[PDB]
Ligand binder design. Structure first.
Ligand code: Z8B
Length: 340
């Protein structure tokens, strides 16, 4: 098998490999697709030793194979051994994307037109995801891929879940949903992250980050995150507190000194006022008052792009959400369509 930086066993269809990046149990390379005569991205995944890894791998594969949308990364092919016994790794082949929003924001200032276009594409993809009754649950710049013409595709559904609002409530300081900086305040207070509003919060954080090239709520650790959120939004209203029945959560908030809201236009003096209005509606403390994806698409900031007839929804929503060996068998089965 061809080697990179580690076995990268993808031939003969895919050749001329170039290292792109790595992970805890995989590696990403670019490669030439000899059938389609174009270069592609290939992700090597080696999840079989660990149950949790098998879970995330199965979620990613099952969701992406079922979704078909311009703003969601597709799976073009899956490479693996012909038998379960011989299967040690799985390679997911995808469209080759020039960069991601994390990398881009490290060195590039976005024009207002780019911010608007990117946000439109994120929400368009998210509308489809939510219409399938699915929560992405880890939206952040590194999970937004971009090609050389700024087409944006949402990736990494390994942490996704089927929405379950009737079972969202939980206690204080227990939950661990999303990546820290993109995590909604309620995750720390009383939410398991089983409602669509969790994703809208993350999009708001991404919007803020596009406006300034710095994360808006840069918590230094899990417990610090709420400090940053409240430091900008200010103290929640009585009405918003009244919505939190859990006493540990409500009393924590009541114990804090009063904090004033910091106006968005002071944080972002160069920003389009319509962007800031939308930002405020996504970064609303009360998840019940928080703007929903279809409302966000219809906001004046996005008027140049908005067209509900060209913002498709899923044909077939997911209706509902085991040892690593069953999981391996399921991954083997889910990937069979691509054999030989
Ligand atoms: N592990 N992982 N490696 C992370 C690197 O792979 C990059 N990457 C991913 Br994930 N998918 C990609 C794709 N379809 N095309 C190009 N680069 C990609 C990503 O931007 C990051 O740089």
């Amino acid at each position: 098998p061809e080697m990179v930086r580690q076995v990268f066993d993808v031939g003969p269809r895919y050749t001329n490999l170039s290292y792109i990046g790595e992970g805890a149990y995989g590696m990403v390379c670019s490669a030439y697709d000899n059938l389609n005569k174009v270069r592609v991205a290939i992700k090597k995944i080696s999840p079989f030793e660990h149950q949790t890894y098998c879970q995330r791998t199965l979620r990613e594969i099952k969701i992406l194979l079922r979704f078909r949308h311009e703003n969601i990364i597709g799976i073009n092919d899956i490479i693996r051994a012909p038998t379960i016994e011989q299967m040690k790794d799985v390679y997911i082949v995808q469209d080759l994307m020039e960069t991601d929003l994390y990398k881009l924001l490290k060195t590039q200032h976005l024009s207002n037109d780019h911010i608007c276009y990117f946000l439109y594409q994120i929400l368009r993809g998210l509308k489809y995801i939510h219409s399938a009754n699915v929560l992405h649950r880890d939206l952040k710049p590194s999970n937004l891929l971009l090609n050389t013409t700024c087409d944006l595709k949402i990736c990494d559904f390994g942490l996704a879940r089927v929405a379950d609002p009737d079972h969202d409530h939980t206690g204080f300081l227990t939950e661990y949903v999303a990546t820290r900086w993109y995590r909604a305040p309620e995750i720390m207070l009383n939410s398991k992250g089983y409602t669509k509003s969790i994703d809208i919060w993350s999009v708001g954080c991404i919007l803020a980050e596009m406006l300034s090239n710095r994360p808006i709520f840069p918590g230094k650790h899990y417990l610090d995150q709420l400090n940053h959120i409240l430091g900008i939004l200010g103290s929640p209203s009585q009405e918003d507190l009244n919505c939190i029945i859990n006493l540990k959560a409500r009393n924590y908030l009541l114990s804090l000194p009063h904090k004033n809201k910091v106006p968005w236009n002071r944080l972002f003096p160069n920003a389009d006022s319509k962007a800031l209005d939308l930002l405020d509606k996504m970064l609303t403390f009360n998840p019940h008052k928080r703007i929903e994806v279809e409302q966000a698409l219809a906001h004046p900031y996005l008027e140049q792009y908005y067209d509900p007839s060209d913002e498709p929804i899923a044909e077939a929503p997911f209706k509902f959400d085991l040892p690593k060996e069953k999981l391996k068998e399921l991954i083997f089965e889910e990937t069979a369509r691509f054999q030989p």
